[PDB]
Amino acid sequence: SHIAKGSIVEVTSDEEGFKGVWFEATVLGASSKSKEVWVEYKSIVAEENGSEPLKEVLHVSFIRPVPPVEKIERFELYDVVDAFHKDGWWTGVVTRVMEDSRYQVTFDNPPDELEFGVSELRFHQKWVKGKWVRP
């Protein structure tokens, strides 16, 4: 259903340095053997200064629907979270609750610690068996 033309999705890659990241994209077409999906990124560009959004043909395994958006005023310590960083969604864990509705999130591969506001975060959900799953 999320494969249908024009439907908004999120896509990932397994090229090293990309595993764990989800970028927002829109479906352009799909195979009706291949089972591939043609997509256009929303914030990623083809190259350089960039006027053309990047297009890509990915296996259906690397495509999922966009997770439902929630009203979120606060996250708790050790909450598993998605952070919107460098135009991509990165999964990490809240390791410190800061003041002014801000949070420290710890990431791995490579190990890192970043500061985020509440608006840059959402709950981490994996898309498994046609269902959204929290850890």
């Binding site: 990241v21 914030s43 990623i44 560009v45 960039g50 990047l54 135009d87 991509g88 490579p110 890192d112």
Partner: peptide, 10 residues
Amino acid sequence: ARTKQTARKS
């Protein structure tokens, strides 16, 4: 607003 490689980490 960025190429795919300036989105990658390190």
